[model samples]
Target: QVQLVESGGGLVQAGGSLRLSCAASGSISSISTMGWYRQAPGKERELVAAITSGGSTNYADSVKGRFTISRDNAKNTVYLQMNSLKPEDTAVYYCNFKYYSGSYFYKSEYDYWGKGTPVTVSS
Candidate 1:
């Protein structure tokens, strides 16, 4: 099976920010939407947002402006950023794949996932 790997640090001081990366080495990036999700401790997976090949995006209202989703088309990778962090932002973050097509016949869903990286915030 294909996989996405997330590798980044776990700790950031209050008022500091972090950049976590999701690298897709197999079939995930080539075949589907590379979407990001956030899960706070003991909470559900919340869809932060998704960026598509067409250069358009959709974001969950709860996370707007606080985070960003971007990609380097030449590098075949996607990145997520949460700036000006606080302790409430601590969580496990994941990058995953969702399939989409321009036609009305297709709908998007997260059919594959990265194992996720644990992120912790403290002073």
Candidate 2:
């Protein structure tokens, strides 16, 4: 079974930045894609960014300027950094991993996900 664990500082004041990490483990032939998501209080999950092993990335327009996603293959880890935060940014963040199959580099859906970390942006 594949597993992902997310770790980071949970609180940040407005205008500050926070760095989040996702560590992957278990049976994984290769990691094709890593995705970051955010779920604000009483809101649906929002895609923050998706980064591929090839160093390509796509970010949501809403967070295009404030969020960055990266990975470290050597450590089997994915990183997310959010800057210029606001109280509205308070949410639960999650990291997802997609395994690479022989024919395709990425799966249609995530194969593993980290247990989301709650973040609170305050004054």
Candidate 3:
């Protein structure tokens, strides 16, 4: 099995910022199709952002503009950076990769996950 490990997260005051990173044991090509998510203190897991193999990025409707998803192909890593945080930002964030039966997309599914990073935002 492939291993995807996550690192980076911390408690930060409101309006502050923090970043998290995900790396894998092999070339994280599946990361081209992103599915980074977060589980809030009491809510269901929610999708935060996604990125295309072509490099395009998108976010959930409620995810603030400060959230950024970046991919480092050479290092097989993905990053999540957040700014202008709020107390509600406390959550466990995770990164997953998409795999395909053949070409990709529609039929693709997330095949790997990181252990996750817990981020706390203090008011």
| TM-score of every model versus the real structure | 0.77, 0.83, 0.85
Reference-based TM-score, model 1: 0.77
lDDT for each residue of candidate 2 in 1-123, tens digit (9 for 90 to 100): 234777885888899999999887743336777889889877999889998778889998777899888877666678899889888889999988887555446435447787899889898
Runs in model 2 deviating more than 4 A are 1-3, 26-29, 100-110
Q: What digit string (tens of lDDT, one per residue) describes model 1 on residues 35-77? A: 7888987899888778875668888775677778888755556
lDDT of 3 by residue, 1-123 (tens): 335767789889999988888876577664447678899866999889887777888897656598888888787888888888888778999888876564544554547787888889898
Better of 1 and 3 by lDDT: 3
lDDT, each prediction = 0.73, 0.81, 0.79
Candidate 1: C-alpha lDDT: 0.73
Question: Which wins on TM-score, candidate 1 or candidate 2?
Answer: 2
Which residue pairs collide, candidate 1?
Answer: none
Q: Name the best candidate (by lDDT).
A: 2
Ranking by TM-score: 3, 2, 1
